[PDB]
Each structure stands twice: as C-alpha cells, then as structure tokens.
C-alpha cells in the first residue's frame, strides 16, 4: 500500500538522520568541517523527511484536510529542504575536491567559518528558490495543493519547472561528477607512481554518483515529460508519479549512511 510504504520510508530516513545528528553533536564533534557539512546535510534530510506524511495523506485520498495554512508551509518547507540538501551534497563534493586535489591551496577555504558560511548561503538559496511556491502557489483550489500561476499558467509553470530541475539536478550533478572524477585521477596517478585504496575510492565514488542519479532523475524526467507531452489518463499511470516521488525521497533516506557510517572516521567516533 502506498501510504504504508511512504511511512516506512519516512521512518527509515528519520531514524538515520536522527542517528547521524546525534553523533556529530555529542559523541563525535563539529569542529571539523566534514562534520559540519554532514550535520547540515542530515538536518536538511530530516526536514525534507518531515513532509512525507502530508503528501501521503494528500495522495491516498484526493483531498487536502490540512487547510490552506499548512498548504503553503508544507510545500515551501519541502522545496527548501530539497534544494538545500542538493546544495549540501554539492558543497560536500566541492570540499572533498579542494581537500584532495588542492590540499595546500585550499587552506583558506577549509575552515569552520567558511563551511558555516557555505551552509548559510545554501540555505538562503533554497529559501529564494522556494519563494515562488510560497507566494504563487499552494491555494489548494479547493482540491489539492498545487501551483496557481497568473493567467499564462502554461508558461509560468513550465519556466518554474525548468529552472527548478536545472539548479536542483543538472548543475549539481555536473559539478559533483566533475569533482569526483577529478579526485579519482589523483588517487589513480598516486597509486601508479608507487590497489585496495584505489579500488575502494572508485567503488565509493561510483556508488555515490549512481545512487544520486537513480534516485532523483526519475522525478525530474517525469516532470519534464509531463510538460512536453500529455501523460496517460488519470487511472492508467497514477502510481508512477508517487513512485518516482518516493524514489526521490530515497535519496535523502540513503544520504545519512553514504556520507555517515560508510566514512571511516565517523564510524570510529560513533564506536565510542
């Protein structure tokens, strides 16, 4: 059942993010830049996870019992959390690239103050990108919480979808892929000069990039196809929409472990 699976995913992600946030703040620490980025990513992931039950209720029955007040707030919170989680992933990739390929030249940038500034900038960017939904959407139209643009509804929604899909997947994915690919070159060359380390690095990088792609791409591709061509009727392919939605949520669900427990240092701190 769709709501039951949504609740399962929400619980799994909530547990993972709660565990990650505990460690950084208590057992491990947050003086480290990597810990700061991991904590910000976990916070973003849990805030994004808080929105699953609302959407599950909204889709199980074609109605929005929560009223107009929560109609705007839940949607804007979800958008902000998605954008800031993508930005946190990009910032983590950039920091890893700077540390690995430019360990000395990146001394100015790899400081706690700079990490906090980057997190704040990402949050501000997420707020700015979510502003249109907060203002120009979520009236519920007496039905379900969706955008209500000015009279040129087709153009406004299309442009919104285009820009959201770009800055939340395409530039982030390209930057992440470039940063991870550049890192492997350094490790491979170092190994050649002197292969468990190179194998581990390659496997970790491939897991990260493949997981990111598999989780969000289905969602934005469906959104783009919806605009280009009319999708099947209401009952033909209703499930696939929320299937891609939950698969996108799977990204935030899997984030805590990929950048958390899999890291050798985090595990070491968590092990008391």
């Amino acid at each position: 059942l769709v709501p039951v699976l949504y609740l399962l995913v929400c619980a799994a992600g909530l547990g993972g993010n709660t565990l990650v946030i505990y460690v950084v703040l208590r057992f491990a620490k947050m003086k480290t830049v990597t810990n700061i980025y991991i904590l910000n990513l976990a916070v973003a992931d849990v805030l994004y996870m808080l929105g699953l039950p609302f959407l599950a209720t909204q889709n199980a029955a074609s109605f929005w019992p929560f009223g107009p007040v929560l109609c705007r707030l839940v949607m804007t919170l979800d958008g902000v959390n998605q954008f800031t989680s993508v930005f946190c992933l990009t910032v983590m990739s950039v920091d890893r690239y700077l540390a690995v390929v430019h360990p000395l030249s990146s001394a100015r940038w790899r400081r706690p103050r700079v990490a906090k500034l980057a997190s704040a900038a990402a949050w501000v960017l997420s707020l700015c990108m979510s502003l249109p939904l907060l203002v120009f959407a979520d009236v519920q139209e007496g039905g379900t919480c969706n955008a209500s643009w000015p009279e040129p509804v087709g153009l406004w929604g299309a442009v919104f979808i285009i820009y959201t899909a770009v800055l939340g997947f395409f530039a982030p994915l390209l930057v992440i892929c470039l940063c991870y690919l550049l890192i492997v070159v350094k490790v491979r060359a170092a190994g050649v000069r002197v292969r468990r380390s190179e194998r581990k690095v390659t496997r970790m990088v491939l897991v990260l990039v493949l997981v990111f792609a598999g989780c969000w791409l289905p969602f934005f591709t469906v959104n783009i196809v919806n605009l280009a061509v009319a999708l099947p009727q209401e009952p033909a392919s209703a499930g696939l929409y929320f299937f891609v939605v939950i698969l996108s949520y799977a990204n935030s669900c899997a984030n805590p472990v990929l950048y958390g427990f899999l890291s050798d240092n985090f595990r070491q701190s968590f092990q008391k």
């Binding site: 909204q58 949607m75 379900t144 919480c145 969706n146 955008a147 469906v222 209401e234």
Partner: peptide, 12 residues
C-alpha cells in the same frame, strides 16, 4: 481531468 505539476496530482 488530472495533472501532476510538482509532487502531487492536480485537479485539471
């Protein structure tokens, strides 16, 4: 009629 704009079904 139904449509899927961002994350949920929309009534026409």
């Amino acid at each position: 009629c139904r449509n899927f704009f961002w994350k949920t079904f929309s009534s026409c």
